[PDB]
């Protein structure tokens, strides 16, 4: 006793990707005309509660970014990561042990559309 059969199929094209990164603060590195990778950085501000007096037209604020030597190693110097608020590039961070770097990064808003007060 035996049997047999047949069939057909096709062929197309696709892509690939990866998803992994959970240690510190969730961030999305973005320093280019159009970029968005996985980064673990956190922005630290001196005092969310601050004002002027309807005097100055432009203010300045540069929070701190907490990342690991490795996490920051995969990137270059001047990479503005958008986390919590907006992509912010860090000047230079130098950890001491266990990937613990922190430096005041500069502001940076992506090309995305955001509502202003």
From Swiss-Prot:
Localization per Swiss-Prot or TrEMBL: Virion; Host cytoplasm
Entry keywords, A to Z: Host cytoplasm, Late protein, Viral capsid assembly, Viral release from host cell, Virion
InterPro entries, A to Z: Phage_Head-Tail_Connect_sf, Phage_tail_attach_FII
Gene Ontology CC terms: host cell cytoplasm; virion component
Alphabetical GO biological process terms: virion assembly
Role: Plays a role in virion assembly by joining the head and the tail at the last step of morphogenesis. Six FII proteins probably bind protein W that closes the DNA-filled capsid, as well as the U tail terminator protein of the pre-assembled tail.
Subunit comment: May bind head-to-tail joining protein W and protein U.
Record protein name field: Head-tail connector protein FII
Biological classification of the source: Viruses, Duplodnaviria, Heunggongvirae, Uroviricota, Caudoviricetes
Gene name of the record: FII
């Amino acid at each position: 006793m035996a049997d047999f059969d047949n069939l057909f199929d096709a062929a197309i094209a696709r892509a690939d990707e990866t998803i992994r990164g959970y240690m510190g603060t969730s961030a999305t590195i973005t320093s280019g005309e159009q970029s968005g990778a996985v980064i673990r950085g956190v922005f630290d501000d001196p005092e969310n509660i601050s004002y002027a007096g309807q005097g100055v037209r432009v203010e300045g604020s540069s929070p701190s970014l907490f990342v690991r030597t490795d996490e920051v190693r995969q990137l270059r110097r001047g990479d503005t990561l958008t986390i919590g608020e907006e992509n912010f590039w860090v000047d230079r961070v130098s950890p001491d042990d266990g990937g613990s770097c922190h430096l005041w990064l500069g502001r940076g808003v992506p090309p995305a559309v955001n509502r202003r007060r």
